Amino acid sequence: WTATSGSCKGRCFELQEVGPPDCRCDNLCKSYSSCCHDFDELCLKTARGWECTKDRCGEVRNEENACHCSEDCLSRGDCCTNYQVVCKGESHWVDDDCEEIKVPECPAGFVRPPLIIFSVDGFRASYMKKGSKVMPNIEKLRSCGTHAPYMRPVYPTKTFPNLYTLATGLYPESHGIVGNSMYDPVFDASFHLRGREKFNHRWWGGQPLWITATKQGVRAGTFFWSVSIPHERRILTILQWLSLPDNERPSVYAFYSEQPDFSGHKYGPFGPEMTNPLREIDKTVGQLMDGLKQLRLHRCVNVIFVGDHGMEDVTCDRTEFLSNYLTNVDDITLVPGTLGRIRAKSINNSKYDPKTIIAALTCKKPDQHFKPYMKQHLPKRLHYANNRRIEDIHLLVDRRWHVARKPLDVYKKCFFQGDHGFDNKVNSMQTVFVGYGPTFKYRTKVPPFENIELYNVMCDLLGLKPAPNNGTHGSLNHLLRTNTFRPTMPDEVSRPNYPGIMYLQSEFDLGCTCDDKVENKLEELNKRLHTKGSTKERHLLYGRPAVLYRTSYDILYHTDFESGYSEIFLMPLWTSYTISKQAEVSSIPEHLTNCVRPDVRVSPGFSQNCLAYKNDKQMSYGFLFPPYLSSSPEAKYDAFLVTNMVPMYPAFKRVWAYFQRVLVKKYASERNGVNVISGPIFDYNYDGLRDTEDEIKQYVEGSSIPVPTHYYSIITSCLDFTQPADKCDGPLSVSSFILPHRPDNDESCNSSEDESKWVEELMKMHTARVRDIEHLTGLDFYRKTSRSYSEILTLKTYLHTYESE
Numbered sequence: 001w002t003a004t005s006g007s008c009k010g011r012c013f014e015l016q017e018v019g020p021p022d023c024r025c026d027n028l029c030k031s032y033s034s035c036c037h038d039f040d041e042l043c044l045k046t047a048r049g050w051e052c053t054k055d056r057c058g059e060v061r062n063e064e065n066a067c068h069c070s071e072d073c074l075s076r077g078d079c080c081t082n083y084q085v086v087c088k089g090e091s092h093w094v095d096d097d098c099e100e101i102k103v104p105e106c107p108a109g110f111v112r113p114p115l116i117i118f119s120v121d122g123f124r125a126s127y128m129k130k131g132s133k134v135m136p137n138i139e140k141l142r143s144c145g146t147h148a149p150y151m152r153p154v155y156p157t158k159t160f161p162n163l164y165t166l167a168t169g170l171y172p173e174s175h176g177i178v179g180n181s182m183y184d185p186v187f188d189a190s191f192h193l194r195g196r197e198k199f200n201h202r203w204w205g206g207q208p209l210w211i212t213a214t215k216q217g218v219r220a221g222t223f224f225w226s227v228s229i230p231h232e233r234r235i236l237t238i239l240q241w242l243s244l245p246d247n248e249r250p251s252v253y254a255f256y257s258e259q260p261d262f263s264g265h266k267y268g269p270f271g272p273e274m275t276n277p278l279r280e281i282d283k284t285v286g287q288l289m290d291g292l293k294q295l296r297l298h299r300c301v302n303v304i305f306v307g308d309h310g311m312e313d314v315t316c317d318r319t320e321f322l323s324n325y326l327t328n329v330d331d332i333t334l335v336p337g338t339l340g341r342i343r344a345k346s347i348n349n350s351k352y353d354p355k356t357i358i359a360a361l362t363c364k365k366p367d368q369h370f371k372p373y374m375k376q377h378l379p380k381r382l383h384y385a386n387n388r389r390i391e392d393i394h395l396l397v398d399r400r401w402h403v404a405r406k407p408l409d410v411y412k413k414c415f416f417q418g419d420h421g422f423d424n425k426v427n428s429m430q431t432v433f434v435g436y437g438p439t440f441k442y443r444t445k446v447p448p449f450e451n452i453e454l455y456n457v458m459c460d461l462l463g464l465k466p467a468p469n470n471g472t473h474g475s476l477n478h479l480l481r482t483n484t485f486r487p488t489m490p491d492e493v494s495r496p497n498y499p500g501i502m503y504l505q506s507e508f509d510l511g512c513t514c515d516d517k518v519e520n521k522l523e524e525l526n527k528r529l530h531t532k533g534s535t536k537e538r539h540l541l542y543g544r545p546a547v548l549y550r551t552s553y554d555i556l557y558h559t560d561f562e563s564g565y566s567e568i569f570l571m572p573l574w575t576s577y578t579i580s581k582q583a584e585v586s587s588i589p590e591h592l593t594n595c596v597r598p599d600v601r602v603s604p605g606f607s608q609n610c611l612a613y614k615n616d617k618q619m620s621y622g623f624l625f626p627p628y629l630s631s632s633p634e635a636k637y638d639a640f641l642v643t644n645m646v647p648m649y650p651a652f653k654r655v656w657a658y659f660q661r662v663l664v665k666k667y668a669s670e671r672n673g674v675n676v677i678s679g680p681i682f683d684y685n686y687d688g689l690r691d692t693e694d695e696i697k698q699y700v701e702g703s704s705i706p707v708p709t710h711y712y713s714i715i716t717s718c719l720d721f722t723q724p725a726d727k728c729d730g731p732l733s734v735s736s737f738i739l740p741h742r743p744d745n746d747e748s749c750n751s752s753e754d755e756s757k758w759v760e761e762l763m764k765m766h767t768a769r770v771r772d773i774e775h776l777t778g779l780d781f782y783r784k785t786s787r788s789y790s791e792i793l794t795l796k797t798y799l800h801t802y803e804s805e
């Protein structure tokens, strides 16, 4: 119930929300059906429109007008945005040359430059260039400030997950807004775009920027605008708020546009009808900047122009129907569209079975435009699994397609020509970032980055301490003139042991064999030096990774590679080696095919054993340092040490062996050498974080050898590829992956073909940031470079996307 007979007189767009049943005058009251009776009359005035004209200049103040052109309007803070231009001979902001803003130039009483976030729904990254002729205000912001060529959204590339990610710095799995539609089984409640349940506070986890600000004594304008409030009125409301007295005035503001998304759905991303919405958004930007110029705030405020996601061409005819695959289609509930999420229609049906649904959806049609996954098998870069609102069965839909349950769902709901929601590495889903203001850099282009990083920066721009989030604070310091955040490297928690030769061969009873009993003071001193670390500067280029948790591990040196060997997990946490451009690939000789050799530095009790692999009919093994890349026949023996062995399903070995035999050398040739760090990952609870020993769900049969869920590699070289990887003076270049360790290759529909037709494709799907691997291993990489730490943080957040330009 609302008692709507209170009044909004003097309360229009009040910042504090008053309590039911008392009627509301804030910019949300419409959305709750709670505004006071006179809200439209007082707060949504429209008379005479939004622009001054010569005849209105000087006019007698009429309080009915939407905005004012009278002489007292500047002092009142409610002039039309073009007032000084029409009436006082001033230029529009867009017509002024840009001039570097070296320091904030702010009115007296201003404690800090305010921040205005100008968010645009569905603003695809390529609009900045493709629409630049019709967006002159945005183009000035872009060219004069700091811009990225694009910004990567989070998955799913839908509105609310992305806007809330912007506000919180959190992946959707952590903030809880995992789609525009959701079912939460603990609450037994549904979240929808339409209607009221979405305002219930239990949906919204983490701590958004407005709450962070408020808790630290920084006042915030509203972030949500009711759709019926016109854009011109949103802008005038912000400008009015900026004219409040110092004790009442907010420091952070947001504007939101429903465009160009609204039109992009109807017309496609580049429909000829899209020009006008881009013109209109640019006009709104111009109103804001003209309004700030009038208030003398245009060289004081930091402005962020940012989108939530892009827009792709999608039509009704490009729909796959689950009724063409499943017999049981009425026993499921599908969240449809540009992603699929499946669960049982009824929790009373014990005949429901995910394995049979997955199998019925796997590689069934030759051009099939979706791929099913148990959520824990989705690419780890998506960070889309650790929330009870994400259904166990997921369909990753190809760009340009939809999935639906049955045809009747599509024609009883062609209308649309655009949609979004796809995998966040798809080029059409990329969106925009521009920062303009005293705290941003001048005429600066920065590389593409992920929207999860912005919360930290917005916190820095307002002097706030960010709440815990998934950004890497410092990774965007290169966007900023000042207010940089100067982090220190985390302290190492566990220091390594450096074991020497402590065990005789006969102490081992591992069931392993090796044809190796074959024999010199010249080369005996030499192999001793390699086991003490004499080649380690070549193989460990950026220092040893730091272990950020309590554990017991050994550093093991060898001619061709260095490793950190875990006594707890019985395998390396990491293995580091450098392959020059000139390295040669050799085979595993016949006599060494089944060779595994005890490591005399490491006790039997802290070693793997071959009997386990013999007994485990499902499990085989691989090696972290590949025998194919040994520097010499004698060095090759090192690669067969039991301390370099890891558990691998035979199906996964096809992937791994192709990576190691073909791809590493290919990358060294293309990149002028590479440094490779490889290792296992254990994430049985799919939380994106290193598992402890007691979370491991699978072991090599009959043993304590834990089975990884994933294998990673981090592949580093010189950005200036005229320098070899091992003699690089400047910035680094990286690509990494986190490959799922699966007992089948059902993910790869073409896996019966030669690995040259499908392995690399799989690896690109599972591309990762170094930071993703850090979370999953508790390791900290690149500890010893000649580079700045901020630069290294940027490197650690880089994702190699494999999309064209």
Ligand SMILES: *[C@@H]1O[C@H](CO)[C@@H](O[C@@H]2O[C@H](CO)[C@@H](O[C@@H]3O[C@H](CO[C@H]4O[C@H](CO)[C@@H](O)[C@H](O[C@H]5O[C@H](CO)[C@@H](O)[C@H](O)[C@@H]5O[C@H]5O[C@H](CO)[C@@H](O)[C@H](O)[C@@H]5O)[C@@H]4O)[C@@H](O)[C@H](O[C@H]4O[C@H](CO)[C@@H](O)[C@H](O)[C@@H]4O[C@H]4O[C@H](CO)[C@@H](O)[C@H](O)[C@@H]4O)[C@@H]3O)[C@H](O)[C@H]2NC(C)=O)[C@H](O)[C@H]1NC(C)=O
Binding pocket: 170, 171, 173, 174, 175, 176, 202, 203, 204, 205, 206, 383, 386, 387, 388, 468, 469, 470, 687, 688, 689, 775
């Ligand atoms: C991305 O960044 C985020 C933020 O930094 C990272 O997320 C954090 O990760 C931590 C580890 O997973 C986690 O720490 C736990 O916090 C528990 C208390 O948490 C509550 O309070 C916080 C702070 O105000 C709040 O933010 C939380 O909100 C969650 O839950 C509500 C819904 O109920 C949502 O509104 C919200 O969206 C959020 O959900 C998300 O997080 C939870 C996990 O907290 C998930 O379950 C959801 O799926 C969703 O993703 C909370 O309300 C604390 O109790 C935990 O402590 C246990 O474990 C420690 C280990 O040392 C142990 O000492 C204790 O014994 C304790 O165990 C006991 O409980 C166990 C579980 O019931 C039980 O089995 C045991 O036997 C014990 O009895 C723990 O410290 C932190 O809360 C989240 N924060 C957020 C915001 O998500 C995230 O990791 C980053 N991602 C990557 C990939 O890096």
Ligand SMILES: Cn1c(COc2cc(Cl)c(C#N)cc2-c2cc(OC3CC3)ccc2F)n[nH]c1=O
Binding pocket: 117, 118, 119, 159, 160, 162, 163, 164, 165, 166, 167, 168, 198, 199, 209, 223, 224, 225, 226, 227, 254, 255, 256
């Ligand atoms: C989508 N949309 C908006 C714009 O919303 C936001 C704009 C920005 Cl710039 C940011 C950031 N950072 C955050 C939001 C936002 C606001 C919310 O408010 C709670 C009452 C629900 C909830 C989630 C959000 F993510 N207004 N109207 C409308 O339809």
Ligand SMILES: [Ca+2]
Binding pocket: 121, 122, 158, 159, 160, 261, 308, 309
């Ligand atoms: Ca959107």
Ligand SMILES: [Ca+2]
Binding pocket: 682, 683, 684, 685, 686, 687, 688, 689, 690, 691
């Ligand atoms: Ca885990």
Ligand code: NA
Binding pocket: 612, 613, 614, 615, 616, 617, 618, 619, 620
């Ligand atoms: Na086996």
Ligand code: NA
Binding pocket: 745, 746, 747, 748, 749, 750, 751, 752
């Ligand atoms: Na297959």
Ligand SMILES: [Zn+2]
Binding pocket: 122, 159, 261, 262, 265, 420
């Ligand atoms: Zn949309």
